[PDB]
Design a protein around this ligand. Structure first.
Ligand SMILES: CCCCCCCCCCCCCCCCCC(=O)OC[C@H](CO)OC(=O)CCCCCCCCCCCCCCCCC
Ligand SMILES: CCCCCCCCCCCCCCCCCC(=O)OC[C@H](CO)OC(=O)CCCCCCCCCCCCCCCCC
Ligand SMILES: [Zn+2]
Ligand SMILES: [Zn+2]
Length: 52
């Protein structure tokens, strides 16, 4: 099954689970998958294997 990513407002300095880099910003810094919890950049969404 595919991931179900949803824009998320990170609070704690959080890193992308795909590319390893920090999720920059105050709000809406990245996507958290609603089913498995994985955090990714908006730009890294298309870059991850879509098996959740
Ligand atoms: C003052 C600037 C020095 C880095 C502090 C913030 C870097 C970060 O918050 O993170 C920087 C970076 C965000 O692209 O996160 C990353 O890649 C991981 C950071 C470590 C990079 C050090 C490599 C030598
Ligand atoms: C001090 C200024 C902090 C603003 C930039 C935070 C770095 C970030 O890109 O923040 C990265 C981080 C999420 O990865 O955001 C966070 O932790 C929240 C940090 C800022 C919270 C609002 C402060 C006013
Ligand atoms: Zn997932
Ligand atoms: Zn990333």
């Amino acid at each position: 099954m595919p991931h179900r990513f949803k824009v998320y407002n990170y609070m704690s300095p959080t890193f992308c689970d795909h590319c390893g880099s920090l999720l920059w910003g105050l709000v809406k810094q990245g996507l958290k998958c609603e089913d498995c919890g994985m955090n990714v950049h908006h730009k890294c969404r298309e870059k991850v294997a879509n098996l959740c």
